[PDB]
Amino acid sequence: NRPNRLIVDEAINEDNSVVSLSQPKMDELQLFRGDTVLLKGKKRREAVCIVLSDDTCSDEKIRMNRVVRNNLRVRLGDVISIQPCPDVKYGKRIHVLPIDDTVEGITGNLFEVYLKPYFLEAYRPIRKGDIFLVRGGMRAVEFKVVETDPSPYCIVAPDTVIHCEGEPIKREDEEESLNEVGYDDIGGCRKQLAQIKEMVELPLRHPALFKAIGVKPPRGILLYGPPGTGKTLIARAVANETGAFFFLINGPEIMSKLAGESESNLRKAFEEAEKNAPAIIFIDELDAIAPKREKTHGEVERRIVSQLLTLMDGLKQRAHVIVMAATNRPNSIDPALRRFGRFDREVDIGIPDATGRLEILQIHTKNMKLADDVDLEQVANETHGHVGADLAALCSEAALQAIRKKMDLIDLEDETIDAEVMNSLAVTMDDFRWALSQSNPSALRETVVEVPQVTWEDIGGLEDVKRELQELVQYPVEHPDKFLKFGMTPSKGVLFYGPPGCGKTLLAKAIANECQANFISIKGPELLTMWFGESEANVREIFDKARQAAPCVLFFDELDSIAKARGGGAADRVINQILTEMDGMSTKKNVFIIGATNRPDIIDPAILRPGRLDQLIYIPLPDEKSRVAILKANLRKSPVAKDVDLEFLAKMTNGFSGADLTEICQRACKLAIRESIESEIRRERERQTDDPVPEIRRDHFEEAMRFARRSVSDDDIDKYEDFADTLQQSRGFGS
Template sequence: MPDDLTLTVTQRPAALDARRGIVRLHPEVMAAMAVNPGDPLRLTGARSTAGIAARAEPGASKALLYADDLIIGNLGMRDGGQVTVTPIPVVEARRVTLTGPSEIVANVSPEMLRLALLGKVVTTGDDVSLLPQDVLPAADHRSLVEAARRSIANRVGYLWTSTLLSVVGVEDADAALVTMDTVVGWQGGAQSARSGAQAHDAAGPPATRGDAPASSDPETPPPSIDDLPGLRAQAQELTELLDLGFHHREVLGRLGTTMSLGVLITGPAGSGKAALVRAVAAGVGATVVPLWAPELAALANDAAAGRLREAIARLGGSTPTVLLISDVEALAPRAEPGPLATVFRQMLAEAVRSGAAVVCTTSRPESVDPGLRSPELLSVQLAVPLPDAAMRREQLVVLTRGMPLAEDVRLDEVAGRTPGFVAADLGALAREAGVRAALRQKEANAPSVTMADFTAALDVVRPTSMAESSLEVAKVTLDDVGDMAEVKQTLTESVLWPLTYPDTFARLGVSPPRGVLLYGPPGCGKTFLVKAIAGTGRANVLAVKGAELLSKWVGDSERAVRELFRRAREAAPTLVFLDEVDALAPTRGQATDGGTADRVVAALLTELDGVEDLRNVVVVGATNRPDLIDPALLRPGRLERLVYVPPPDEQARAAILRAAATSVPLDDAVDLDELGAGLIGFSAADCAALIRESALAAMRESLEAATVTAANVENARQRVRASLDPAQVAWLEAYAETHQPA
């Protein structure tokens, strides 16, 4: 086979590859071209670009090159065009210069930009995205890529997934691989330092090296404390600490004591931790020396230690100075700390002992080395909370201060529909609403932002805490659920009230229900009920099937449970839906899996009713076999409300048929009430399947059919059978009788 091939390019819709510079080939084609995963390829169409090779699925076509929309655009072609594919040697890029939207240039430092491009092959004139290349990362760069993903998302908000940058130039190469030694920079702006041992000498003066994201640059005006609603208590405490340490140490001397200015600030990503430090520092007349821990961790140990020494040396001048280290878990990880972590702790201890002010921030306190919290290091700890509805409204007032809002804009309603949003997310929401208003009123002399703009923005802006969730919430509510009035009332009281009216529960001095178990025959609407609750839009939804959390590796299952509830707390108010919960929490002492199930049950019980309070989080479990669930999970304080979802009766079946047939053109002769009366033993899923099969029967008769006739429905009736097992239904009804509240 020749070195180059002509293939047909086709767009690969997989989100995993999207805009990451990846192209996929059939494994046999790669073997014939002597190409390995991760090798660069020259792609020539209407113009020339490059990509990283990866294997396609075994069932893929050997004649196709699978690429994303970005690579197809860089080729100057459309889906289905002919592309010449040629292997090229790996050439490391010495210097890459880019340009992009002003808001991206202002918020993404060269170091962040380099991590976003790490492992990509770039060509002059290409468009590239900020999405890190996490499909084929080098083993020693995997943690850096993950850190880049979190930090860029925090800085830029939802824009990071859609923004495209232009490659202005690639020095001394036509197509080259971005590595940690590549100098990456903005056109006419800051550039990154090299990562190797030469970084210390080659980087230039501290003010031009890009030590931190541009938004932390000293020239950027610090925010006012008044512009940080919800953080005034933390700002007051930090102000008192820094003011005493910087301006009134003589009082401490007269009292015969000392103080430590080591502070650890924890809180959700994007909640304003760095902004809090900058605002307080400005208030006490101090300057801020920012460091981004993931960027230091990416350097060679000697270079990173040199950068740390430089930053700490700047704390000893006559001007009060605060060293701000963001995402400190990258320098001091809880798991597998390396030599750099030891050096960092030593330097931090020396700086704090000398009286310097060092503030570290993290959104993942569980991943930080516990030793950092010792009295001689970070002795003061401040927590930035997730904003509640009232706090979100205050933040929206600040963020929309310069916006001409229409009279119909109700910020209270926007705040109520943004559970789990932090300040950065609300800023992204306000920007998106403004963009939509501008697109709609390009020629207007006095444009304004309407409630419709905010509603449209809510459809695309997701909270940072839900970035890893791909759940699509259905546009249905409990009002769309026919019949089951008693079940809907119980769910409203047990699930919606605790998430919507937490203040009422607090005022009455009672704790809201912690969880609900839905049980009933298969196909009777348990999952649909949860979708209807989620469709109210008043809570974030984390959905997981019980078996998805189980792993054969020791400790992985328990960690998955802890991670699930950690995300739920961060995104509160949150609805956690555990489908097939009997697979996750079977009765202990009966499993033969080496104790994994028992440990998972213990972890689940601890999360639901342990020492750490589960605030504004409601758990809903669903099962067909409630008898298989560990009894400890069903006691008060856990899944305490047991709700039986019965099979539909005659009226309910007719209502389900009507709902399923909303978009189906039924002939006037089709009587759904009569049809529902005859569907004995049919579940809700069976009724929906009957309508679907009726439409298919009409298509079998004629692809030009305009309506579904009674004959088509009767034909489908012969094909679709009742799925309910009478014995199972009788057993579940008996179980409901013995377990219903007195």
């Protein structure tokens, strides 16, 4: 039917009165950016909005904020009709009232703090019956438009009168709160959130459709990841955005009950959910109820486990119910639960990446007034090893710091703290740097999986090797069809070998960056850390996380460290298992394995077998051209004098490794800083009785050159040159 009908989608402009279409659709229904559009949703409600163009928006979809989304009584995936509305006229009076539960903690002049800057210069199209949201004074309050003089909808011009008559109204039964959790409250893990969204939309959102079809949906989705990553958060969001009934099972609470009551509460939970289908039963801290079969020693505890198992099987009802569960330790869960027909789907909600943490930070600073000096992206880059909860907490603590120092002044009369005072409250970048020092990040020891920021431009020379890496890794990803036509499947892995400090580690990260694929680094020593017993299970989890992160490059660095320890029964079991995991790794899975070693003489020939690390790429010391590129790359970030001759520098340093060059750069720079520090003191002495000299000069290099030493001896090189010729012969007898 008609073109005006459109599908609801996530928002990009967090602004309430803004909806977005594609320019091809904005042309189709003949609307432009300024236009005010009228939206008709379900439950016979209307909302009016400013339309805009959005390059990301698919033409059959309409991006609307969750505020708009609620006013229509609509959710993601539903259909709404959009139509131009030039008939909108400026208001005389608008009468908005707050909702009690969103203000009962806060006092002051609601009209002057929130409505004022919200409508000022905003020209917001509003509608009678709409509920809009204003964030400020570290609080978010929602007002409902009770009346407009040009009803039902009017624009809010500066001329318009806006009144609030004191006492707030209660929430209507149908009016979902915006204080509630949503997808816009979760960041940095889109990919996982997508999979969860996929599995659950079809059965929950369209229940009759799935009962009629007779094909099986997922019923048990298991969320796992480190603590505080937002597992409990996600479950609530999915339930609210789909509008499904949400029944919470808090692990500890169930297991805190008597024997009989525990099994009972489980039964009641499932029964009530089947009753109010569609629903999500969420089991938080599952390992509390159902740990490994051995550790469950204590018989009543085993009864509860089986009880749960019967209830999960009890989804024979298939009343449109999904059971979600969260756990810190996937390994702790009774494997009986991860059986088919129960918790069959697993989502790794990992630690957030750099961009992710930034996103998180933005969500928990929404309501706070931040000073201009605050650069959350900087905070984001510094907060490595931080998890969602760490960030949410540090944001809270940075706020409480800003509160305390600003309450030193208010303390002269602590009785009257107002919202007006709260909006005046600014949060300095210092308040954040403060919270950083006070932060106790949990996930520093967690294995990180993200796309590296080392690019080709950080690596000097080896240009043709970069291209061979593009052949081996990038082409089979971006051009699978092409490999199919030639009838060849690509090699699984590569082995870097060469003298120390030539860029083997950089290359592994480099090719990853080019392919925009995830990266996993595993150093030799890291593998010898695992207890004798633990090692077997930990290796398997590594290859599993590589699958999760496909397309992914798995890099085993510093293999020399392991090779030493074997010729040692511990290190041996590890590698044999790594070998086994490679073979189990299907080539089709888009998981690429790279090895690196400074010791090609002792590497296990079994690794070099066809199908494993069969691509033997030798990485030698840099020649004269490369040495220039290396020195340039490292010193990009450094303020260098035009005096410095690097090509002359290159010839002098023949025999030096890539690392040996960064050695000279750092050594020369430390003199430059040494000079900068001793000069500030001299300037200090001169004032006691403005033109600093921050730039590195020729003698600094000439001094560093004077003390520079070589990491790779000549005898070592001559052997390395030989191994470049005979490495592939090691599968026979020892060369």
